[PDB]
Structure formats: structure tokens, C-alpha cells
């Protein structure tokens, strides 16, 4: 098996405040095939400059997807008072062909922080935490989002210095605010920037310890840590489940600026994943310390044939989704990105 280190000795889990309505915002970001948003490069081989049609799991063009945002906890000027999270834990999302995440989209811009409408801070890139399980169950209190045995959990750590992925059984602690405990809230991760994000004070398992209080790790199959540089530049994360194993794709590892997705890690899980839930994250910081954070976008993938344009570097600058519309279908028929205007076959 694997060792996650000593379990948290905290008597009770920290109280969580759920404000889904405050978190909800109008932020539409449709997938743009033209800019090759969320498309994985063919893993088999590099391709020639001439445009080549390729068939793979791909997000629908023009699909906004699901938007999730992480915001700082309610805080008095002297100290933080309570965690602030949405109702993401209750929400359960079906996993079929896997999903692609948009990270750092709102970074490098200034927008009001979710916790205070009056307060405005520069938005900074933040990294989402995802829990994927073969099966899901109701919570002891009857809330949705409880996860069964052998559920994979991925959490970024050290303000995004490293990413930790582990597939382990989850056991709720009996402490209050934990799922087994009275007044149970929701599974969540909490970090303090001064305690860990300050240089030389980084804690390798700080995110794991906060998750451990809500759910203990029992008989974990394996624990894997991958170190990813933290950058404001937009990056894409892709996760899919195959019989050979789970595949992890990071844009930052190969083409951070391009946004093209290339597999960086292989996870040996042969169990099919049918359900995934986003894990809400709360930042424990004072009101001055609290800053706006980027909102992650999740897009489901479905098998489709996409015209692919390859640069001399070979990166896919642009793509065409034939299924999206009749105009794209005529481009797909000719297998050419640009075609002379003509009458074309239609449904």
C-alpha cells in the first residue's frame, strides 16, 4: 500500500460556510475550436504542416462548460473568521470520456473578489482540486457527494508549487463538521498564505492535512507527487480514464503559451470512473490579504473528428469542429480549412 503520514489529531473539522448564490456569476467562456481550446495533441506521433483530419475525444465547439470559482473565507481585518465555499461538494458530475479544465483564464486582470463585492483585487491564477470515484454514495446526513472506496483525489499544494494525486479509501472523522460528526458541513481544503506560501515556510502535506481531517486515507493504493511551476499564463489540464490506465495531460509541461494539451503523467488505475466532483477550496487570509482568484472552467469530452492545422513547430494553432454546423461540415468534407463558397450537402 502507501503511507500518507500521520493522520490529523485535530478534535473537530473546521466549520464551512456555503454561499452558492454569492459564488454564482455571469462569466461565459465558450470553447473556441479556432484557437484550439482544450484539444489534446495526438499522442502517437508529431504531424506534417499540411492540415490533417484526426478523430479523438474532443469538447464541443461553442460549449461554455461548467464554471467553478475559489474565494477567500470571511475575514475580519485582524484575523479570518470562517471558511467561504460554494455548494460544489453536493453537486455530482458524470464522468464518461473525461473532462478538460481551463486554468488562469481570468488571471492578469482586476475583478471584485467573491467574498466582498465592494473589495476589488487583481485576479491571480488558482488551481482546481478534483475527486474521481468508481461509485458514489449518500452522506450520513443525507447530503449528496459522498465518495466510495478507492476514490482518486488530486490537490495542488504549496500555493501551486506541487500537484499531489493519490487513489485511496476515504474515512470520515467523528469530529464535529466532519461528515460523520454532528453539524456536518462539506469536504473542503483550507490553506493560509502566510503559514505555507511564504518562501522557506512551504509545507509539503499542508493541503493533504486539511483534506485528511474531513476524510482519512485508508489502504491507499499509491501516492504520487508531480512538481508544476506556478504561472499566471493560461494552462489546460486534461484527465481521461482508459482500460490501460488514467491519463493526465498538462499544457504547462510542453506548451504553456500555446495551450495545447500533452500527456505528462500516466496513472495505473484500471477501475472505470463514472462520477467526478469538484472540491471547493477556501483561503484562510485576512481581508487585506484576501485576493481575487481565477475561475476554472470544466468541459466534457465526446468522440468527434476535428480538422487539425499544424504549424512548422507542429503545435496545433487552430482546429475545425465538423459536427458543430453545416459550414464546418463543408470544410470537413473538403478537408481544407479555407474553401471556395459553393452549394453543399446538408442534413
Amino acid at each position: 500500500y502507501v503511507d500518507v503520514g500521520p493522520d490529523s489529531v485535530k478534535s473537530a473539522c473546521i466549520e464551512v460556510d456555503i454561499q452558492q448564490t454569492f459564488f454564482d456569476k455571469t462569466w461565459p467562456r465558450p470553447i473556441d475550436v479556432s484557437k484550439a481550446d482544450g484539444i489534446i495533441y495526438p499522442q502517437g506521433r508529431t504531424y506534417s504542416n499540411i492540415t490533417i483530419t484526426y478523430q479523438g475525444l474532443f469538447p464541443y465547439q461553442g460549449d461554455h462548460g461548467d464554471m467553478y470559482v475559489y474565494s477567500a473565507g470571511h475575514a475580519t481585518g485582524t484575523t479570518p473568521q470562517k471558511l467561504f465555499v460554494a455548494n460544489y461538494s453536493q453537486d455530482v458530475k458524470q464522468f464518461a470520456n473525461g473532462f478538460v479544465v481551463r486554468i488562469g483564464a481570468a488571471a492578469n486582470s482586476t475583478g471584485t473578489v467573491i467574498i466582498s463585492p465592494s473589495t476589488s483585487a487583481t485576479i491571480r491564477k488558482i488551481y482546481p482540486a478534483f475527486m474521481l470515484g468508481s461509485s458514489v454514495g449518500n452522506f450520513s446526513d443525507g447530503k449528496m457527494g459522498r465518495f466510495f472506496n478507492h476514490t482518486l483525489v488530486l490537490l495542488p499544494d504549496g500555493c501551486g508549487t506541487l500537484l499531489r494525486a493519490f487513489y485511496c479509501i476515504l474515512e470520515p472523522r467523528s469530529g464535529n463538521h466532519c461528515p460523520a460528526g454532528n453539524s456536518y458541513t462539506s469536504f473542503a481544503t483550507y490553506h493560509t498564505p502566510a503559514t505555507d506560501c511564504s518562501d522557506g515556510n512551504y509545507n509539503r502535506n499542508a493541503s493533504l492535512n486539511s483534506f485528511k481531517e474531513y476524510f482519512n486515507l485508508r489502504n491507499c493504493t499509491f501516492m504520487y507527487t508531480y512538481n508544476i511551476t506556478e504561472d499566471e499564463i493560461l494552462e489546460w489540464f486534461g484527465i481521461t480514464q482508459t482500460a490501460q490506465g488514467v491519463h493526465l495531460f498538462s499544457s504547462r509541461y510542453v506548451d504553456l503559451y500555446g495551450g495545447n494539451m500533452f500527456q505528462f503523467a500516466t496513472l495505473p488505475v484500471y477501475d472505470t470512473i463514472k462520477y467526478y466532483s469538484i472540491i471547493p477550496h477556501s483561503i484562510r487570509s485576512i481581508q487585506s490579504d484576501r485576493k481575487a482568484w481565477a475561475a476554472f472552467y470544466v468541459y466534457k469530452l465526446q468522440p468527434l473528428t476535428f480538422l487539425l492545422d499544424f504549424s512548422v513547430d507542429g503545435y496545433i494553432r487552430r482546429a475545425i469542429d465538423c459536427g458543430f454546423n453545416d459550414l464546418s461540415q463543408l470544410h470537413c468534407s473538403y478537408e481544407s480549412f479555407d474553401v471556395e463558397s459553393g452549394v453543399y450537402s446538408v442534413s
Partner: antibody
Framework: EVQLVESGGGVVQPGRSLRSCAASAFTFSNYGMHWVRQAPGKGLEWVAVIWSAGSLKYYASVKGRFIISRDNSKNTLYLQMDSLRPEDTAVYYC???????????????????????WGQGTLVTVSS | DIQMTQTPASLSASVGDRVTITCRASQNISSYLNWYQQKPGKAPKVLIYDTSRLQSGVPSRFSGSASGTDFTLTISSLQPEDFATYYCQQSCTTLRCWTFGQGTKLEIKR
């Protein structure tokens, strides 16, 4: 706003089954119910504790003699007493207990407790 | 289990006097200890929860400090109404059983 009352306490023969506590105008579903027993010549102790879910029940000086079942829709918690003895017989109080929340890094403290409306108690007596 | 005995079963104290009440557990299983003040016809009240921060709704006159296994409560400006039986409970999340205070009755010394 919390309302707590205990019912079904009565004089009983030894080795008898006696049905408890009721709650009104309160969020009983998310709050665990704790039963405490006081008898003359001995200090207050918690005879039985049940979680808000009610899946797990803890009994504390008896071999699980007390049986506790709570219905949140009913808003009433049912306690069963069996093999009752004169020394065992005592007034029983039902109250909801919530542990205080604390922040380790800043030392910040949140009371997070609902000890209000502690049960008045019901007296059960064994006599011959 | 835990064996707890309060050092005085009953304490006689004059009005407006400074006195210490000590309850000693077999061992201090947890930092949190719930002191309880009981008045006949009145529901039990938690004087202190962890012995480091006073419980809300409790007067500053009762202060609980624990040295070693023994836990000591310090009271000043005693009053006839203030006098009440004192119970101390050691609370441990792992242990289902909850400690019961022996009880100390307070009467005037004169």
C-alpha cells in the same frame, strides 16, 4: 427559540420497558441529541449520546441497556429503559451539545454552541 | 476508564473570600476539560470548555487553570447565591464514556 421537553417518565416495576424526549421550533436534524442522568448522591453523567444522523449511538455504566432512536421528521428522540433498578432510577435530561470551533494559527475562537433550552428532566421511580 | 476524585467533598467558605476548588483525574486524557456549576432547580452550566478560554455567558470570577493531572478553579468575592455544587468533566473524543464530577457543596465559614 430551542424548545426541549422529556415525556414518558413514570413509576415502573423492576425489569420493565419504559419509552424519551421531544424537540420543537429547532433545527433538530443537524444537531445531535445527548441524554444526561442525575441521581442523588452521585454527579451528573451522560448516560447516552446519539449523532445527528442517528446511524451511530454511544451508551455510557450500562451494557448498552438504553436504546435510543431519533426521528427528525417527528422532531422527537425516543429512549428505551429496560431492567430498571431503584439505584439506576433517576431524573433524565436531554440537551443538544455542539463543540466550540477554534483556529490554531491565529488563536481565533468561535463559540459555535447551542446549550440553550437544556432539558428540565423527567423523574422515573422504582417503588414496591 | 478514568478515576476522578475531587479533593474536598464539601468546602466551607466565608462571604467575600478567595478559595480554590481542585478536582484530580487519574490522568489528563485531553486538554479540553468541561467544568460544570449546578444549582438545584437550574440546568447544568459549563464554566470553562478547554481551561484556556472562559466559556461564553460565564462570569470572570470563576477561572479554571489545570496544573498536572489536577484541575483547579479559582473564585473571589464569594456570595451565598454564588455558592453551588461544582462538577468537573474530562472530555475525550475517542472515549464514549464521560467523566462525572463528585460535587463540592459550598457553605459560609464563620
Amino acid at each position: 427559540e430551542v424548545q426541549l421537553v422529556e415525556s414518558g417518565g413514570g413509576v415502573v416495576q423492576p425489569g420493565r420497558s419504559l419509552r424519551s424526549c421531544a424537540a420543537s421550533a429547532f433545527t433538530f436534524s443537524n444537531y445531535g441529541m445527548h441524554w444526561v442522568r442525575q441521581a442523588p448522591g452521585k454527579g451528573l453523567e451522560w448516560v447516552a449520546v446519539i449523532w445527528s444522523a442517528g446511524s451511530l449511538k454511544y451508551y455510557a455504566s450500562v451494557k448498552g441497556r438504553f436504546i435510543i432512536s431519533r426521528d427528525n421528521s417527528k422532531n422527537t428522540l425516543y429512549l428505551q429503559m429496560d431492567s430498571l433498578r431503584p439505584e439506576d432510577t433517576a431524573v433524565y435530561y436531554c440537551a443538544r451539545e455542539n463543540t466550540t470551533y477554534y483556529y490554531e494559527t491565529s488563536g481565533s475562537w468561535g463559540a459555535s454552541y447551542y446549550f440553550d433550552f437544556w432539558g428540565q428532566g423527567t423523574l422515573v421511580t422504582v417503588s414496591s | 476508564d478514568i478515576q476522578m476524585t475531587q479533593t474536598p467533598a464539601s468546602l466551607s467558605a466565608s462571604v467575600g473570600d478567595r478559595v480554590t476548588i481542585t478536582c484530580r483525574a487519574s490522568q489528563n486524557i485531553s486538554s479540553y476539560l468541561n467544568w460544570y456549576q449546578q444549582k438545584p432547580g437550574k440546568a447544568p452550566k459549563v464554566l470553562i470548555y478547554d481551561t484556556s478560554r472562559l466559556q461564553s455567558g460565564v462570569p470572570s470570577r470563576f477561572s479554571g487553570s489545570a496544573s498536572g493531572t489536577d484541575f483547579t478553579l479559582t473564585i473571589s468575592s464569594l456570595q451565598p447565591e454564588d455558592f453551588a455544587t461544582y462538577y468537573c468533566q474530562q472530555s475525550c473524543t475517542t472515549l464514549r464514556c464521560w467523566t462525572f464530577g463528585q460535587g463540592t457543596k459550598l457553605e459560609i465559614k464563620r
